[PDB]
Symmetry: C3
Subunit: 307 residues, 3 copies
């Protein structure tokens, strides 16, 4: 059943699906420690097709595949591929799908993963499509939260920053729909969460409050998920200069924060999280990075139908 | 011996008496948990005569009586009684005392409880007389302190706010006379503790320092008992506007406070304690409210001669 | 081998020597607790020759000698000795050395201890020579650090204040040469550590960074060793007025400090460490004073050849 499934939008997953990925992720995590080399993916090839920059998503996926015993092909720069000669996206996928058993694609255009999944008879995983979705990030974010707070429900989660272009929070907000939590969306009014998404989450009954001042909600938050201003998604630099550096987390802001407050960030960060926060017990973004491998290993194995 | 005793001024109690009430209070507290319904007061009626507003003192006393198995009569508004037709206080008590086995009275005039106790052959408990005394508050405050710090002596207690009109701190300061503690009275010079009381406490040998700046003493305090400015006791509003909002406890003030510092407040609070303090480990005012029932249950049982 | 050795410069000790003193110091410490009176120094006399003021170094040494079972002679003020008649230092030592079995000298001129050790056939211990060295302070500082952090290496130590005239940090920096630590020298540019010393420490491979702003390094420090501005060493008061009160440690500065950060100070302190820091878990300067006796007891016993 998991074999052949795509991972395009977090909205295509139920609470059971997410739960399964996270439980399976823990499985492979421990399993790795024991064997130090798994073989579920022996004879399988993962093609990582990145049309925009990535450090974590590409490297953790390729890392996961090797830990699973598979092989990896792909490109990190579209300029080196034949898209350079003018080839289209659907032609690229139709050709590359014949070389691998699973595709992971990051593209600057929203809906690129859906288009790829449509014309591929190989499972397609969305590593980020424009400012739309980022399903595997959400899945590793939820893994981290459950791992850190031991449990899902009963949490007050705050999403800060560029909620408008941040594909990470678009998916993360949608996934939280299956959990009993109070969501707080803190951001400049120019970078608010897509109305439709905030609408839907309340169309299902979730306490969602949109605010501009962080200190208003800081004190009751269990989770503070910080984001980066997606400079590369703005219409032009002027549109970005108008919201530049207009939020940041540091020791001062953390004065009115609960002792158990945990701060996350999909990364990379520019300056929205002062490095002084790093040494604090609050910071968990680098532990967040770590969980990406077992979560991505679970996804690869599941979708390749090897576990 | 306890049967028939009144509870007018905390000065009418020895260290033994206070200790007994607190030990007995713990007894009934645990006992309640077990039986979930006691009967010491079966066939006894408590008359709560409140001539001014109350939430905690009236409700906790009535609550205590029911937990003890007794019945309750009384009025929360004098306007609904025959004092409306012009009846005096002593006539009110002489008549009502024939209907109950114990009276709890809160009146806006100092000495009202003494006058009531004088003309009643039923035990009379002072729930607050003007800006004079508040014995059961002090008794539940001491219960809370011993309960929180495990013990009485060796503490540095700071009383902040309206020490002039605050009947709660007038009694609380007097009771502390039996304990080895350093008292700090922080308040505007217009709202200082009644000279006589501060005099007496030092006439017995207690280190009592009166200051205007809280931060001067904040760092060495074990207990910080905050009070509300008694607006309704001032000569007129102008007299109150001159000391309005001139003290408050929040996270900033708590920067220079000991980790074990515990903050109390007889309540209600207007703005003298910022709600951000609520989530902190320092706040114990709502735990303070809780202890009022077993303390008041102990007092009712003792004075009714049923334990 | 230890018998007859002098203690002039911390540079005359190897890592083995320092380690031995500290282990031996722990020995005598526990031993004292048991017997409550030792006799290693029975029949031995310590002469404390102080030509400048001292509270800790003189008193802890005399204290140590008595705990060891020895006797003490000496002067705290040179004005009362025959140096008053014009006697020289070498004549003073040559004469006094005939009366005791060990000398402890504090003098305002750099090299005074070396001169004393040269013309004495009795062990000479430098309790401070001008702004040059202070070996027993360093030895008790290292004892405190190992005692507090359980271990030596892997620490980030910050030395703040008057590093120019502070004989305490001149020796302390030199001793740290044998340990794997990152040293941070924070001080006004007018009070920087003697170039030669900072040079040498890096000539051996130690990460040594000299800065003016404390907050730059505060966050990563394990140890913060504060010093006093050596007013009495300045050319004149004007030279001292130019660097007066230009550093201090208080709760504000400690906002960006690690929870395990430990603050030390050889003492006395004027105002460079706000007394509010005292109650904090960071302060250990008075525990630092305590360790001086067993460290000095170890030194006396070792050098007198009685252990
Ligand atoms: O780039 C961001 O700000 C968040 C997010 N980041 C990641 O997925 C991590 P990376 O770009 O290193 O793979 C994304 O949307 O690509
Ligand atoms: O009203 C105050 O500020 C303190 C004190 N408060 C109480 O006893 C609680 P309550 O008025 O709710 O019974 C009082 O003097 O009545
Ligand atoms: O005086 C100082 O600031 C540090 C140091 N202090 C001590 O040794 C302690 P004392 O002067 O009390 O013996 C010194 O150099 O003499």
């Amino acid at each position: 059943d998991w074999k052949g499934r795509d991972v395009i939008s977090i909205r295509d997953f139920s609470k059971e699906d997410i739960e399964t990925v996270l439980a399976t992720a823990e499985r492979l995590e421990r399993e790795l420690k024991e064997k130090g080399q798994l073989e579920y993916a022996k004879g399988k090839i993962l093609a990582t097709l990145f049309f925009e920059p990535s450090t974590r998503t590409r490297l953790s996926f390729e890392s996961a595949m090797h830990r699973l015993g598979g092989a990896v092909i792909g490109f990190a720069e579209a300029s080196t591929s034949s898209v350079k000669k003018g080839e289209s996206l659907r032609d690229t996928i139709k050709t590359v799908e014949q070389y691998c058993d699973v595709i992971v694609i990051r593209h600057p255009k929203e809906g690129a993963a859906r288009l790829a999944a449509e014309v591929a008879e190989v499972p397609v995983i969305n590593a980020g499509d424009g400012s739309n979705q980022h399903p595997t990030q959400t899945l590793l974010d939820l893994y981290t939260i459950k791992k850190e707070f031991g449990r899902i429900d009963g949490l007050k989660i705050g999403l800060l920053g560029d909620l408008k272009y941040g594909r990470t929070v678009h998916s993360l907000a949608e996934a939280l729909t299956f959990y009993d939590v109070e969501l707080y969306l803190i951001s400049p009014e120019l970078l608010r969460m897509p109305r439709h998404i905030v609408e839907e989450l309340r169309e299902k009954g979730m306490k969602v409050v949109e605010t501009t001042t962080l200190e208003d909600v800081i004190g009751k938050l269990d989770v503070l998920y910080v984001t980066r201003i997606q400079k590369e998604r703005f219409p032009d630099e002027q549109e970005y200069l108008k919201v530049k550096g207009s939020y940041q987390v540091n020791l001062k802001v953390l004065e009115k924060a609960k002792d158990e407050l945990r701060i996350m960030h999909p990364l990379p960060r520019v300056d929205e999280i002062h490095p002084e926060v790093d040494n604090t017990k609050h910071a968990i973004y680098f532990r967040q990075v770590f969980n990406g491998v077992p979560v991505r290993m679970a996804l690869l194995a599941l979708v390749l139908g090897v576990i």
